[PDB]
Paper text:
The HCV NS3/4A protease – a chymotrypsin-like serine protease – is a prime therapeutic target that cleaves four known sites along the virally encoded polyprotein. In this study, we report that four chemically representative protease inhibitors – telaprevir, danoprevir, vaniprevir and MK-5172 – exhibit distinct susceptibilities to the protease variants R155K, A156T and D168A. To elucidate the underlying mechanism by which chemically diverse inhibitors bind to the wild-type protease and drug-resistant variants, crystal structures were determined for 16 inhibitor-protease complexes. These complexes include wild-type protease and resistant variants R155K, D168A and A156T each bound to telaprevir, danoprevir, vaniprevir and MK-5172, with resolutions ranging from 1.10–2.50 Å; S139A protease variants were used except for telaprevir, which requires covalent bond formation with the serine 139 for efficient binding.
A156T, the worst of the resistance mutations for MK-5172A, sterically clashed with the P2–P4 macrocycle and caused a large shift in the binding position away from the catalytic triad relative to its wild-type structure. This altered binding of MK-5172 resulted in fewer van der Waals contacts with D81 and R155, and is likely responsible for 1000-fold lower potency against the A156T variant. Overall, analysis of the four crystal structures explains MK-5172's significantly retained potency against R155K and D168A as well as its loss of potency against the A156T variant due to the rigidity of the macrocycle. Similarly, vaniprevir and MK-5172 exhibit significantly lower potency against the A156T variant due to direct steric clashes, while danoprevir partially accommodates this steric burden by repacking against the mutated surface. However, drugs such as vaniprevir and MK-5172 containing P2–P4 cyclization likely select for the A156T variant due to the rigidity of their P2 moieties.
Residue numbers in the entry: 981 to 1181
The structure:
């Protein structure tokens, strides 16, 4: 302890994006490691934000955050209770729910939001932090199966990323991979209706 020397955790910092605006998905880095560490400390990020899916970092982890209905959502297991860096300084979470593994901040100016799905469709697509678009069959409210299994390395750092309907509506937020002996066959996600409930409380 000793209060005079106690440290503060830094802000979550946007360090890039998954670009989905064209015919090709690809990852873009907007901030390297030294700038990220500085921005984490001040909570002041003057970078212009664009797009729906951000790549975010703390001091110890890198993962995704997805804008839906003007809220930038990610996983509690990545972000904890942290603020996010913004042009005006650190921004406090608007939503925090450890039970859902969910947090949200006001979507950054410049971001674009995905629309919540209304199709009731079960043919889905998971966007990874490396900008891979993996097909996923919905198997329950919060479960989908990967049409082609991958090692868990392949999904590491994609928590907070979106599951999309063929149209491109947001169906959910990737939470955790279900694996056996290191191979991911299934995914757990936070369905968008759970977000929408949270957005009414
Ligand atoms: C491989 C990619 C994968 C998506 C990733 N998710 C995880 O690694 C989660 C985090 C943690 C364990 N995870 C797992 O995926 C494990 C693992 C063996 C690692 C594959 N699998 C697993 O549990 O399967 C069991 C069926 C589910 C039942 C148990 C699910 C419990 C979910 C969960 N809830 C809470 C609530 C509150 C918390 O407070 C701190 C913490 C939590 N942590 C949790 O799970 C990811 O990319 N992360 S990340 O981006 O690298 C990182 C920066 C954030
Ligand atoms: Zn839809």
């Amino acid at each position: 302890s000793h209060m005079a020397s106690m440290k503060k955790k830094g802000s979550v910092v946007i360090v890039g994006r998954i670009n989905l605006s064209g015919d090709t998905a690809y990852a873009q880095q907007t901030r390297g490691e030294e700038g990220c560490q500085e921005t984490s400390q001040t909570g002041r990020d003057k970078n212009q934000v664009e797009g729906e899916v951000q790549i975010v970092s703390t001091a110890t982890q890198t993962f995704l955050a997805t804008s839906i209905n003007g809220v930038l959502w990610t996983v509690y297991h990545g972000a904890g209770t942290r603020t996010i860096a913004s042009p005006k300084g650190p921004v406090t979470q608007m939503y925090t729910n450890v039970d859902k593994d969910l947090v949200g901040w006001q979507a950054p100016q410049g971001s674009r939001s995905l629309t919540p799905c209304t199709c009731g469709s079960s043919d889905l697509y998971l966007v990874t932090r490396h900008a891979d678009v993996i097909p996923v069959r919905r198997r329950g409210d919060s479960r989908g199966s990967l049409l082609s299994p991958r090692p868990i390395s392949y999904l590491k750092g994609s928590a907070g990323g979106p599951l999309l309907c063929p149209a491109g509506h947001a169906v959910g937020i990737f939470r955790t991979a279900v694996s056996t002996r290191g191979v991911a066959k299934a995914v757990d996600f936070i369905p968008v209706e759970s977000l929408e409930t949270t957005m009414r409380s």
